[PDB]
Q: What sequence folds into this?
């Protein structure tokens, strides 16, 4: 249905000439939102994003193509499926970057209820996807509890200490904080902050965190399914906090938390929690070899919860 | 009158360290608009752009200088002349990039008619340009019909087939589609989409199309005179469609079509045609040699119309 | 209090892979503004900036960290102190970039007076800084007169001529003019232009001016304390004029003037003077050696005033 093509320029690129993952997340979300709004005919905001995995890391000079489609509309929400291809403009070769799902919610104005049409079903796949959407919705809705329950099976005893020869390090020097002011290009015409914009900012903070652990070149491997818990509008300040949670050989998990404050809330210290997300990075050296991250040694009560958290999340993924 | 200077940074650059043509079009249009508004004292939108040819391709590290002036004001419209120079900041050498004309229309608010002053005429050239503007206006106004009539002299018989040894290729794999959401930085303070912004987006889609034919490094040589057919505002989605129309040795023509939809129109499938444009590209290889494009083999009814179209347009240019 | 972290990407970089000084000024100002607004709970605009000196020039691939804090609140204004660190992401090494002060003014809406709380004082330094703020405020307020008085001691006789073998050059070919349209991302949600945005634009014009003198690679060394003389809003055009004022061996002073016009004022030729600033640059050659600038030969009445001006400013700095 909706198709976006973007040539990767220096402006979208990192130090290493690779597409910023955050930039890609923003583009995915924009395409998805437009697919939702083509179905709904009103403005739509990002409700949640499913697990997204990146199969390639696109480079300056290549062209990204993003296709998004409404697979099913429920009451106020719809599931959007997204496919991202990359094409090399010298060899003409195309590769799959990512296949993903995002959920959008229609935001009518202002006291009118919205009536979402039935999505048109033509091919076999259209009908299969329409069923699968109800299943995928169940996973979305049970996700918080699934994790919360796995956490009950983890130790909760903070006595874990690695040997001196293990070479474990603390995560303390990998914490990162940043802040962004939400401006009119960051929000739709009703002033609601784009979810893609939040994701792009998230990822940029998170990558710095990964960098402070390996001192190499991180690239994003995946982001876990997460929910936008509440609205953000123009004028908000979004405060980002990220830290490494755990390592698993060639993977590191960085968690990031996003809090919103309007000008008043900002002075009064009381913000809203917009979302939290968990990003897995790999990293390469200058000879392009995969880096093995050190073992992590949790110290604080928070350190430990996040060490177990990354584990619970990893096991939920592998399944 | 109005002067803009821009140092070319990585942010404005392509993969090859060259100024994005689309970025240059946006800058030209901004300077021109400011010249129009300095004369009109109200907000002004891009009505049309004349043929624009690029004599050099500027590079990261050089400085662009753009001078625009109102040459003549009519009733609601005025002709703006633009000159673009590039300076190399290591050798100090300046070169002409482009000499161009654009027409702007005053958009008063909201029920008041606008009274355009007579442009001040001082030098010989001021008086010559004032006359030439009336002529150039005639060419602008007769342009659609001039083309439409040349098309009557072309074959209209779709039987054209190149030999197998000719090595002609179809244009099918060079089509490109993209989409842009119009946000507040993309429009003036009355919400009207900048024409320069549309041009920048146009060119970025078009260059991808040229790339899919040669698998090299395109650079823009010219854009044909074209008209903005109707307004666009914040909240519109602009859908771009581009394809190669024809080749002429070292030149390829890419056409691009721009349709606007507000949120309602977007869901109801009924958009407005904003403009269509036709861009000529050259391309270089990695040893910096001009590429010769393959011969084009039209297949569909559309293929043929655009094959003839590029010819009609080329002949109108050469004259 | 307020912490911003930014990884330096190609998008923020110059031709030479170095962070744009203007980009850094924008980031400093944003962080500072957020510190002011965290204290005031209303929107705050940049009133003035103190002397700022840059100790390092950060590069693509490094991470900037900016910490800003309210040191003292007066009646409507507050002093903000800022510290900028840079971290190399390969060696993990951190270096001080800059320590600075900026003054913000609360802009309540619209007929309500603002009541600024007393800043909380905890550490020794908190109490020292609170006193020092009253002193630093005195320097801010006496700055225009201090300069004006030094100028009385300078020659005012325009007879200064350097020998032919001195190799002095005129500044005439280093003047630069540019223009920027103020758009919604350039202003807070009340439409007031960000001071940081003006600074970023200032610096980009000024660096071109330095470039036209040495034909090398300028990097910003410092900006003098200056005042924003009046408000700017969305829709303004900001006209920048810059020229080299004087040279002092490895330093060159570039002055820049900023005038604002709304659409009406723009057509009627009557603008507002927003600020003027004076920036000192060094420059390196391609083998990374410091460039020695030529001696400057003033010619016009303006040339001479600015030659003396740069001197007065230099002496005020050294003290
Ligand atoms: C998403 C949101 C609307 C749902 O909030 P809520 O308090 O749970 O309200 P409800 O439980 O009544 O759910 C409303 C709809 O959202 C859906 N929803 C709730 N949680 C979801 C999740 N984790 N994943 C997918 N859909 C979800 C529900 O299925 C429901 O769909 P339906 O109306 O078609 O049946 C709300 O959390 C929100 O506004 N989030 C922020 C949206 C936003 O502003 N995004 C831009 C970035 S800030
Ligand atoms: C340009 C526009 C105002 C003229 O539309 P129109 O339906 O042809 O109306 P008119 O025929 O009455 O022409 C109005 C004026 O535009 C001029 N005009 C029309 N077509 C033109 C063209 N191809 N080139 C130059 N000027 C043109 C006319 O000469 C006339 O000038 P005048 O009033 O000084 O004598 C209209 O097409 C439009 O709004 N285009 C979009 C403008 C815009 O929003 N640009 C931003 C990018 S979307
Ligand atoms: C800064 C500004 C508010 C002060 O203007 P003014 O005509 O001098 O008015 P006042 O003399 O009554 O001063 C008002 C306050 O600004 C302070 N102020 C004035 N000049 C100052 C300077 N050079 N440095 C620091 N503070 C200054 C005063 O100390 C006073 O503080 P207080 O109320 O807490 O005691 C005014 O110049 C302005 O609006 N500047 C533009 C602000 C702006 O829009 N910035 C964004 C970029 S355009
Ligand atoms: N104060 C902080 N400093 C650094 N990183 C943080 C901080 N708070 C949260 N984070 C990161 O954001 C993630 C999400 O935070 P949160 O939603 O509070 O859940 P949890 O701490 O249980 O993981 C954390 O896992 C962590 O990686
Ligand atoms: N569906 C499409 N797919 C790819 N490119 C297109 C498409 N439609 C239009 N274009 C490009 O945009 C140009 C302008 O289109 P249009 O105004 O419809 O005129 P025409 O098709 O007669 O040239 C076309 O020449 C073509 O190059
Ligand atoms: N017309 C101009 N052309 C080029 N540069 C200018 C021009 N006007 C001002 N500038 C630069 O801006 C600076 C500030 O200008 P202004 O506030 O008028 O003070 P002064 O001219 O006394 O220094 C000048 O020092 C100069 O370097």
A:
């Amino acid at each position: 249905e909706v198709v976006m093509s973007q040539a990767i320029q220096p402006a979208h690129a990192t130090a290493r000439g690779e597409l910023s993952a955050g930039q890609l997340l923003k583009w995915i979300d924009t395409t998805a939102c437009l697919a939702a709004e083509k179905h709904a005919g009103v403005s739509c905001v990002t409700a949640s994003v499913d697990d997204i995995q990146f199969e390639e890391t696109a480079r300056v000079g290549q062209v990204i193509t993003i296709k998004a489609k409404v697979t099913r509309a429920f009451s106020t929400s719809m599931e959007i499926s997204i496919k991202v291809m990359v094409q090399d403009m010298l060899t003409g070769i195309e590769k799959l970057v990512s296949v993903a799902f995002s959920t959008f919610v229609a935001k009518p104005v202002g006291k009118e209820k919205i009536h979402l049409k039935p999505v048109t079903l033509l091919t076999e796949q259209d009908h299969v996807e329409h069923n699968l959407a109800a299943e995928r919705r169940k996973v979305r809705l049970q996700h918080e509890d699934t994790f919360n329950n796995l956490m009950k099976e983890s130790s909760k005893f903070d006595d874990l200490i690695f040997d001196e020869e293990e070479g474990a390090v603390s995560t303390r020097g990998t914490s990162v904080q940043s802040i962004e002011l939400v401006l009119p290009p960051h929000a739709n015409h009703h002033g609601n902050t784009f979810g893609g914009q939040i994701m792009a900012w998230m990822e940029t903070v998170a990558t710095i965190s990964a960098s402070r652990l390996c001192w190499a070149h991180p690239f994003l491997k995946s982001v876990d399914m997460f929910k936008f818990r509440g609205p953000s509008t123009v004028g908000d300040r979004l405060v980002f906090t990220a830290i490494v949670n755990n390592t698993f050989q060639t993977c590191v998990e960085v968690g990031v938390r996003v809090e919103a404050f309007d000008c008043q809330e900002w002075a009064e210290g009381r913000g809203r929690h917009i979302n939290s997300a968990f990003l897995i990075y790999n990293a390469a050296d200058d000879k392009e070899n995969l880096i093995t991250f050190p073992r992590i040694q949790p110290i604080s009560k928070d350190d430990f919860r996040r060490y177990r958290g990354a584990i619970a999340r990893k096991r939920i993924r592998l399944g």
Notes: Helices of chain A lie at 21-40, 124-153, 195-214, 263-267, 301-318. Residues A 45-48, 74-77, 103, 105, 140, 192-193, 195, 198, 227-232, 274 surround coenzyme A (ligand 1) (CB under 6 Å).
